[model samples]
Target: RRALRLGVNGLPNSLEPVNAISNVGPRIVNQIFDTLIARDFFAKGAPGNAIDLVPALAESWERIDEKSVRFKLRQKVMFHDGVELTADDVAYTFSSERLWGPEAIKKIPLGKSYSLDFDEPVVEDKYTVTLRTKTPSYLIETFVASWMSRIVPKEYYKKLGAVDFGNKPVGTGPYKFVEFVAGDRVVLEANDAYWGPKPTASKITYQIVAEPATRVAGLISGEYDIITTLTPDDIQLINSYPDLETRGTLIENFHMFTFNMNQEVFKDKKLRRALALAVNRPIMVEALWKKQASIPAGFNFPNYGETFDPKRKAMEYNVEEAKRLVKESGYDGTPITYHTMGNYYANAMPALMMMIEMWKQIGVNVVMKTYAPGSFPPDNQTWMRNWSNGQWMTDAYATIVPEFGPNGQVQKRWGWKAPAEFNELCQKVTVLPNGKERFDAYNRMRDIFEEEAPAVILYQPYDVYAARKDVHWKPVSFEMMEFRNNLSFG
Candidate 1:
């Protein structure tokens, strides 16, 4: 059988461990590492046909207390270098490493700044391990299942520092890392010694085709077996091919134009409300996204199913109302710069263009500025401090807290600060358990955000991708596209 080749749309920013900050790196890493507790299929928010936490190195786990959990190790799970994975290795992962792993390091607050403190992860026995959190984290299960929590062998790190480990990683996963040629391709060979059912393919290769046209062309020409991203224009072409298959789902993500409330122009709630009301989300969805997307009620994603409140309607559209509000806010044709990443989201450019034209009709001079997706973090911070802050949006809601909340890195970078009440509410929401209490708290937070207009909540995008008919893979609403949960190919 031939090796399975996957074509991704964009080149990864960096694969260096600490700098592996984007979706591309972790998508590669998912094929190279396994997690502790997999999500139970019956569990809510578990991606349909996607495996939740199942035992990897840690055979089984359960919550023992509010702040503590226990894991039973799977003995003799070997890393690619033939080193055994143990509880001690897990302890060192959290303590010694500046970045726990890719996803955690990028998304989690604790991992972002290396702020998570660990007294020690207690090793009760060779096969038993216990982790105690500083605070009550009811959603520890979700955290553990995250790609960042994947256990790495300490011996591998001892032999190679962080930088080297990023390129040549060793893990007890279904695949072993082979070679990564920057801006081109990454190769991985199947792990025959894998403890579970071995993968059918002998090897898997990921080729980075940055251009959308090139990527779709490669997919159509059989240059790639599986292509992950397909633009609206490419969908019709792909469907025209009999051998190809396309799959899409509404993911637990959204894109929004954020405003720096601390700035003078956005300080007035009416102006912000006007901006929200001015743009037509459904029209953009139809024109740019071809009605393949859904309107997001707020910042949170409804597909998560756990966080959504269907009763809440999205902000309504009224151009006259928008003009009235803009006038009332004392803004008479103030020039505003809307910042967006050129290549991050599928409809980002067209969406912003539409927004620019919409805002212009309301008597606001809007200028659209596009930058490389990776460049936005640093560039946005500089603008937050000096120039008129620009428009920014991301597919990840996890980024919201870090970017918008008071004391958030991005917030501080922009020199924008949220009110004390809003800041305190967000802090409380994080610690609250995932129940009515958490939902209610999130509701309040959502209301405050909408009312205050820290940023304009734009439309949420649907997750869209294409796959080969020969391969049977489940789509993850979130990223890190692992196919292992009840996934099989004949």
Candidate 2:
């Protein structure tokens, strides 16, 4: 019997998938829950391009048409509570009562960000379900496997309600929740009744240790088997230990600065473009990531298949042009307010400072205001804030459409009202399949994004992790920590 100990920086906001908000939520809940389709953790290389999809709860699936997909669920799968999973559960999971209902949107705004655009599942039989989209959803398979797609038992969840169910979750996964002391630690035991892969450890405890110094100390002292959220600076020191090792890779995400267009100062695109041109992203990568990360070309990725353009450049570092633009805008020295967490994102504190100074060099005044874990100001008060984009789906339809297009998070939360042409293109990209015409539409959207400068695209971050040599584990993606199959105690 092995008890694996993990030291983490923070606990998840909620254990329930729909109620979960932060990245930390998925990191922990994923171990307890199972999605319809699971990403291939053993797939080599970066996640977006290298992602290989496989069945988890759903044994098989096929596109019925451009607008519908039918999934055949695996029978005899048992939840941790000893209940058999069925097509009714699948229908309830995506039903209006669960995900798409108005009350659900009001309860969990982050679910709205995921925006799964399908009607309730149609139970064709005991083990088969069909999902018909409101519109022609080309990335229907990808959407079913993404965040908020975790399959939860209908009766258990409805009986306990969202809050109580999250407190004591029951799922058909390799791990079962035992204890969760918020802000302190979460303890999970092996689900001996799991329908799929067996757990490697008898018990797993994720203890919240906020400071990196303390986390690293525990890892070295053999108090903890592994620790997560390591900085590049800590990588060398951790590897220096005789019994410890480190692993890292460029995740499928990029960091950037988002502006509140409601603010009068940011209303001028020239001023926004000036701020964008001022920051040196490559230098920021070198300073913060230790040259381990590379600058993302733009919103489009190589994994986007036919839509990806090698020649698409999203950012530029030019101090002279920035200064000239600053002058051309006839900008009075308005104090642009910038807000960021101290260390929420890896090396975010230093990254924000570096960008502010870079802006200063190009004749811009930026005032830094640090926020605690969740005490940030409202959208109207915020002039600029740090943002990161995750390429969960390999297409612009999923990433760009949800984040920057009309009625998206950019418009809904970031306060950047897009133009009519951009909004139209956003809708246009959703229908067009993988081809040159779709590629051209995507390129046109990027052109609008670049010209408007609503958000300045920064470098993709390289996430680094640390563990004891005997603790066999690897990070398959930024958001998943699959212990059942990917971890072992040597």
Candidate 3:
């Protein structure tokens, strides 16, 4: 069979494993590496369902005690380099490298409270393995399913070192790295000796086409097979084409304008609430997004019905209230700057423009400043030092943890600090033992977020992507568009 050529917009900043933290980079790496377990089928299901630990390297696993879980390994699993996987390898992978992965393992509350002793991943006759923790962790399954949990060849890392291992990864996945041309394309060839069902396509190519129009043109002309990050304008053109079809689902990602709470102008809750209400969400949705997205009333989206309260309504768009609050907060109509990234969100600039126009109506001098996407870190550092302005991604645990986990750049950018109470609640929520008690704890944290107003709540948009009629794919709960799990090519 001919190789499936997948063309994506934008080249990953780097192929270095430790630094491949962005959406594009992770999408490419996910196929190149496999995890011990996979996320649940329905993302919005119960906590257990959300972290449905499955057998990948281990055929079966059982809890030995409150603090220990034992896994039975599958024989004959081999890395791309022909090295057979063993229990010792699993133990070595976690102990040596995962401790240093993007998020420092020490920062994980569970990992900190209960020491992870990997010395116990015992190899009993090469088919059985056992791992013990100091205390029981509800997130043990999720920790194993994390992308950072990808198994690495100990010998390869020993020879190459952490820096070189990233550039040239050796994994036991369906595909092997062929070549990566910086700012051009990344190519991977199929691993003929894959343990699972082999991909129909012999090769996968990720091409970097940053412009939205260029991506749409490539798709329409059949120059590309699969394209992600579709703009609202491109939706109409692609839908009109008979040979192409679009597949999208409501994703957990959301866009918001963040105010520096530490700054005086936004210190007052009433002022913040007023500003939130002044922005016309429905108008922004219809005019900017063409109603392609829906407004999020709270931190979680409506799709997460079980976790989110359906009856809750977003703040109403009221200019009179905004002015009244501004007066009460003692704003003398001094010019306030709204900073945002250039290419981060699809319609961010227009949305900011709409917000600026609305704020102007309420007697506020709002200035717009757009910064390059890469300049966010330094810019945020300056802003955090009391420079006073910026818009950034909200710290949703899923997306934020990977990017802002302890050493993640965004963590430093926003100077995120979790209050002691919030941290305690997070720790408690993780170990509440899969039931309404756990959810009730989560709801309390959500309320804390509302009260704190770290970042303004905006609409959670659906993950939109375009595919050819010959392609079959489904959206991942984490909003990753990859050619794995339930993918078919007709």
Q: In model 3, how large is the Cα lDDT of residue 35?
A: 65
Ordered from best to worst lDDT, the candidate numbers read 2, 1, 3
On lDDT, the candidate that comes out on top is: 2
Candidate achieving the largest TM-score: 2
In order of appearance, the predictions have TM-scores of: 0.83, 0.94, 0.79
lDDT of 3 by residue, 1-490 (tens): 4566665655555454434544566667767776666555445544112434457777787777655567777789988899998877777556524443334343221222222223335556666666655456544544566655667777776787655666677888778888887767889888888887576668888887766677778888877778876657667778898889776654555767766554566656666666766878888888877787767656554333344456665645678877887778767777887776543455666777888798788777777766542454444233211111111111123322323234333334444443556556665643455467655665666665555555566676555678888776666645354454446777
Task: Give the per-residue Cα lDDT of candidate 2 at 103.
Answer: 73
Residues forming the 10-long window of minimal summed lDDT in candidate 3: 384-393
lDDT per residue for candidate 2 within 1-490, as digits (tens), equals 6888988877765788767645567777887889889877576654333568889899999999998889999989998889999998888888878777677765556565566566767899989999777888788888787766888899999998877888898888888889989868899999888877888889989898777788889988878988877778888899898889987767777778889888777777888899988888878877788998768666766656667788876566778999999999867888788887666677777888888789889889898888765467778778988877767775667568877877577777766767789998887778767777788888888888877888988877777779888888877655557675677877
Per-model clash counts, in order, read 8, 0, 0
RMSD of each candidate? 4.9, 2.3, 5.6
Candidate 3 clashes between residue pairs 3 or more apart in a chain or in different chains:
none
Ranking under TM-score, best-scoring first? 2, 1, 3
| lDDT for each residue of candidate 1 in 1-490, tens digit (9 for 90 to 100) | 4587888855555443324434566667766776676544334654553434556667788789877788898888888888788888776565534343444433233454322223346788877888766666554555566544666677776577665777777877888888888767889888888877576677888887766667677877878777765556567777887878777665544566666655677656778778877878888888877887767666555433565577876767899988888877877665777666554566666777788799889877777766553465543332211111111111112444545666455356444456677777666755665677666666676777776666666555565677677777766655446655434566
How much is the lDDT of residue 425 in candidate 1? 67
Q: Give the runs in model 2 whose Cα sits over 4 Å from its true position.
A: 43-49, 328-331
